Amino acid sequence: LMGPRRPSVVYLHNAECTGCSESVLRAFEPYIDTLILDTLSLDYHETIMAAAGDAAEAALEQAVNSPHGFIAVVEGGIPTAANGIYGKVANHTMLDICSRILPKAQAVIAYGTCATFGGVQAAKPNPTGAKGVNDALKHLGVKAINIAGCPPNPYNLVGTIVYYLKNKAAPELDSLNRPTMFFGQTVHEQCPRLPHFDAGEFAPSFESEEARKGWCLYELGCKGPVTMNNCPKIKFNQTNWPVDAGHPCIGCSEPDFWDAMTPFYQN
Amino acid sequence: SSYSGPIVVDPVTRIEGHLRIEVEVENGKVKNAYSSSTLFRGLEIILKGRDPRDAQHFTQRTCGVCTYTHALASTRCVDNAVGVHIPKNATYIRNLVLGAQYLHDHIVHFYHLHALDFVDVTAALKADPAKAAKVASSISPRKTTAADLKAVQDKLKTFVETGQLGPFTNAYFLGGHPAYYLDPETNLIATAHYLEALRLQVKAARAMAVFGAKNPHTQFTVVGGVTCYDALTPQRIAEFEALWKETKAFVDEVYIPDLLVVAAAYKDWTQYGGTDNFITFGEFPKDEYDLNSRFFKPGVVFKRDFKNIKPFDKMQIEEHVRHSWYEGAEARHPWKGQTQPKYTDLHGDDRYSWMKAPRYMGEPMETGPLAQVLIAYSQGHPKVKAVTDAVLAKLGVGPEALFSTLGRTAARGIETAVIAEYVGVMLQEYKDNIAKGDNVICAPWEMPKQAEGVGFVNAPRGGLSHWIRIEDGKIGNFQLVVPSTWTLGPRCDKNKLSPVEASLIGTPVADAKRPVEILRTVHSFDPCIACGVH
Ligand code: SF4
């Protein structure tokens, strides 16, 4: 799978919906083919790898034990309840898999709010005791770079990897371990509707002429003011983002947002 | 020379989610099978007590491959519960984003999830690009030259001689494999198109964000309609239309010809992976409250009796737990559903999966493109009939060939082709409606204190239903019954094998260490375990 020349990436899937994986496939300039053939060596990835079963387990072992070293990218929360039983791969709990592999990585990136902070399955009452990577593995000294969002902007993953490869270090991180180059501003301070906000010009309903006219979505629940992300700047798929589609921000790059930001249509 | 004994495939890769497949092999053929889903999240438990308006944001996160589908199902479900009839334009926009989801999903499934079961990428290195170009140009109106395919070969050569095979590490085809049949040139064409599809899918997904804010995980639906006033503008409609047009060209000119070339080379695969019973919910409504207003209509078929399609009765669905890791053994209709995890480890108390086992009138039912296509055909759907018949004639096979792994794979292509065309029809109707001066996209509604609702989506993997019981204006019960739950859940309390389990019986396996034949059948159902278990 690996060796020298391209940096080895091991991509793990814990308790996840595969939306973070899909977001990376939307990579643009560079595209995912450039990333996989030229930039990186993608040495394990359950969604797209050819090997399955024992052959896939062997490819994972080969990648993790490489003298050349590897980068881990982790999608999904780690279920920790009932000794990790709620999530297994190859009959190993996800907690055990991550506890064994992540301390061997040269760097770990937690990709998506599930891997950074626990995510949707950690929402109350958290029946599987799902935890973010750094929370679950604090004891092992794992300190993943957290790229949050549900799913994050793939621009933020690629920018973080490129930085790491160039500088041999993590970029400046905020107090949630997210890179300040992407997460340093609220969604709200970047939003085109901020003049209506300042003017107290709020849509009272989605059917209203005020919503048609693009008035602020704060009264309809928008969490832009308490959410850190670069959505209005970079946008998604080179073309849009939630408020420009007329829907409030649901706070999806914040910890515990499923419980902190709900009801989503209230402020 | 043929293996007797167990084979375990864990993880099953090139699916969504965490699947363990177990088989018993006798004399080189599968005689028994178990479909074991090995992650649980419990979204139904998490939803209890919450605002019904919030359900679609949580359930969308059931799955990011079949992104949007669950937001759509939950929103249809809560729309239904509150009794709102959304405006025509909300129906059009929702329908258009769903049609775009199918095209993205099926193109990625064929190339990036399924094709490595059939395509030896490293043999593409020994192909003659000039011969390969001639073959590629014979099967498509798109002209491919020798230089075009050499560029691909040059790029692959450099990748392979680096020794870092990445996603091709330990592939079942490395060094050759008796169940891989393609010649080098066909491997090179398929590989070229795999790579091409990696960039094309970016545009197919972008089509959803034009109206739907972003992909993955759209953010434009609300109870009552949609939020995206910008979707009414000629600029956004034009942007959507251009992405759709390019995506449809790729379906017509690259995916379907490739599908046919591979199916022709693997015609033995009409002999494996058949199933008996089919269910489909219909999709792309004119009337949100009438399934029979959908472009594809609902139906149920037992024992391949397509001459006697039965009406779909939503009250005949029960989800079993006797072979699942939940409390007890009682099957439940989803408006009386229960999600009470109780793990017993693999085959502990004869339980082996986190999926429930949905049964329709007690029977295991395949859902997905092969159900939608066959039932639509049988209902006289003219577009489905014209495409299916032309595929059958190109392959030189009879309709019976459809009841197989190859047939299911072909049906996913037929449905992609048919939906790609129909998106243009919906788009034009949408445009026509705007031109009449209807600019309304959301309707007002009120939250009842007590209600029941159900939302039906025919997703790229089949019939999806979300079920809500509202109590004191909050979520009293919320149950998802997802297409992969139907197809890949375990046995029921009558011990009937699920569609995937049953389909696996009779599978030949040439090399037990590299059981690509099991992957071909399992991948032909396009499993989604995050969907199936939620
Ligand atoms: S962060 Fe969101 S999109 Fe990513 S795996 Fe979790 S639920 Fe899915």
Ligand code: SF4
């Ligand atoms: S729509 Fe949201 S992010 Fe934009 S100005 Fe209003 S509250 Fe802020």
Ligand code: F3S
């Ligand atoms: S919901 Fe998420 S994608 Fe951006 S606009 Fe809000 S942080």
Ligand SMILES: [Mg+2]
């Ligand atoms: Mg369910």
